[PDB]
Coordinates of C-alpha atoms in Angstrom, one line a residue:
X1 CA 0.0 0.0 0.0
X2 CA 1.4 3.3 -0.8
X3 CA -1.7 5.4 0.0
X4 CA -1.0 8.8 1.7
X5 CA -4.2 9.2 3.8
X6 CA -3.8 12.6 5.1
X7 CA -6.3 11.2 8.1
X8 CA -4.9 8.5 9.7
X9 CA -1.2 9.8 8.5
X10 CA -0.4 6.4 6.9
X11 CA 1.7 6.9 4.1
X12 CA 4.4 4.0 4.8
X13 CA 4.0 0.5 4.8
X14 CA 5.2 0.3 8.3

């Protein structure tokens, strides 16, 4: 997933 939700802040794949 590379999505950069600007909500939940998840932009990594952490």
């Amino acid at each position: 997933i590379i999505y950069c939700n600007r909500r939940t802040g998840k932009c990594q794949r952490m």
